[PDB]
Amino acid sequence: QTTTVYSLEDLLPYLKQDNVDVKLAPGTYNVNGFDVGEDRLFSTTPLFLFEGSNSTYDFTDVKLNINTVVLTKFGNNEVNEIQILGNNNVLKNLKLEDIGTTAPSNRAQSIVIDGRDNRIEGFHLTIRGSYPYGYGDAFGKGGGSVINHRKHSGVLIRGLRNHLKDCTIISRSYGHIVFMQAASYPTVEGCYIEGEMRSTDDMLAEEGTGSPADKVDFMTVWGYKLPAGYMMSLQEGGIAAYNAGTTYIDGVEIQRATDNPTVLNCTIKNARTGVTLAHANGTKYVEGCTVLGCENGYSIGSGTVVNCGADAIYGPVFKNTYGSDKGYNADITILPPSDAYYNGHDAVAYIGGSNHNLTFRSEITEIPSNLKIMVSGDLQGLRVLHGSNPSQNNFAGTNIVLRNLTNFPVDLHSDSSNITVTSCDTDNITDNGTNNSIEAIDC
């Protein structure tokens, strides 16, 4: 029943059909600029548009090389390499690599998952080609940028009950690695997700070169000159959910927030955030995850983070996003450093909002003097200085259980109230709050 094809040309008609079982034969397939045009292999974008439903596509031992010049061959329009519009499809085992670093004319996504009940499993994706590449989001990630951007993100999960499973996603592009827009019940499971980092000090060393950042005197979109002493991802979110998107399911165009996301047994390295789901609605659940060398570890707003780890070399392992955060329950291990420390945020965690139950565990004995668990206060976060992003900083925390099974110090700010703290040591706890309880635990 499986049909095997031996070229991209013979693959494309099956994408339009329902209930097919198709295999693209092992080999290397190249997509170049000359493959785009009216009489060419790819006359439209998305390049591979999966419109059928109830189909299975096997890409075992397939290497698909897409030249990044293709991101410029469709005018000033978004280019998606793969988009799934149908339902109940399974795509497996493709190795997809962007060749070169040519930026999109507008913007690009490697994979977009619409429809419902689709699964992409076992893919190996390498994302390349974006502008500007080397500043993270310092000079703009949305409208009103200081340096105008041509972003290129990895996997965009939308639709309903769509599933990214056992994939490796490597990004060397300015964009999210895995993100969700208008996705209901998305699941990310068993994935390895990886960006790369650059220090703000290395960016500031562009002074006098005539670089794009040098020409704006390093004035960030946050309203201040780029501060020294931070490590930034060149990517955006590793696994990030946003509240405003459009998706299509069964011909219906839907504009909604992401809801009910689940993230299981993923490892996320060198992204702006490990897992951020604060903007998603419904039930948020994160379990078994490992976050290494990200600017922020876990920020889900409300829900459960359990049996998860993060190191603190570049930023806090935990952050409450807003003072509106309620019901965030977490059990997070602060992992040994994956690399040298370079944490300009002066915090291992920033806690606020209300009715949280937070446990931190760690075997670390070598504690950098600037790292502390903060409950309320003025976070020295890269994007929240000098009143920038004001709702994400300087807010109160009330009625929170904090179980500090670590050697990290704790600072309870004046805006903290009714914090129930238990800690291995109470001598390194500063309490300036109201009606807080501090009790010692024996290891």
Residue numbers in the entry: 1 to 443
Passage from the reporting paper:
FdlA from Flavobacterium sp. SA-0082 is an endo-type fucoidan-degrading enzyme that cleaves the sulfated fuco-glucuronomannan (SFGM) through a lytic mechanism. We show that the FdlA-NTD adopts a right-handed parallel β-helix fold, and possesses a substrate binding site composed of a long groove and a unique alkaline pocket. Our structural, biochemical, and enzymological analyses strongly suggest that FdlA-NTD utilizes catalytic residues different from other β-helix polysaccharide lyases, potentially representing a novel polysaccharide lyase family. Here, we report crystal structures and enzymological characterization of wild type (WT) and eight single mutants of the catalytic N-terminal domain (NTD) of FdlA, revealing its unique substrate binding pocket and identifying the key catalytic residues.
We first measured the enzymatic activity of 12 mutants and found that eight of them (D137A, K141A, H176A, F179A, E236A, R240A, Y242A, and Y242F) almost completely abolished their activities, H279A mutant retained approximately 65% of the activity compared with WT, while mutations of Asn243, Arg272, and Tyr322 to Ala only negligibly affect their activities. Two positively charged residues Lys141 and Arg240 have their side chains pointing closely to the C-5 atom at the +1 subsite, hence are potential candidates for a catalytic base. In contrast, the R240A mutant exhibits visible structural changes around the active site. Specifically, the Try242 residue was rotated approx. 90 degrees, and shifted toward Ala240. As it constitutes the catalytic acid, the hydroxyl group of the Tyr242 side chain is essential for the enzymatic activity, and its improper positioning may severely affect the catalysis of the enzyme. These structures suggested that the loss of activity of the R240A mutant may be due to the shift of the Tyr242 side chain. Based on our structural and docking models, several positively charged residues such as Arg240, His176, and Lys141, located near the +1 subsite, potentially serve as neutralizers in FdlA-NTD, weakening the negative charge of the C-5 carboxyl group at +1 subsite, and making the C-5 proton susceptible to the attack by a Brønsted base. Next, the positively charged residues including Arg240 and His176, which are located near the +1 subsite, neutralize the C-5 carboxyl group of D-GlcUA at +1 subsite, thus reducing the pKa of the C-5 proton, making it more susceptible to the attack by a base.
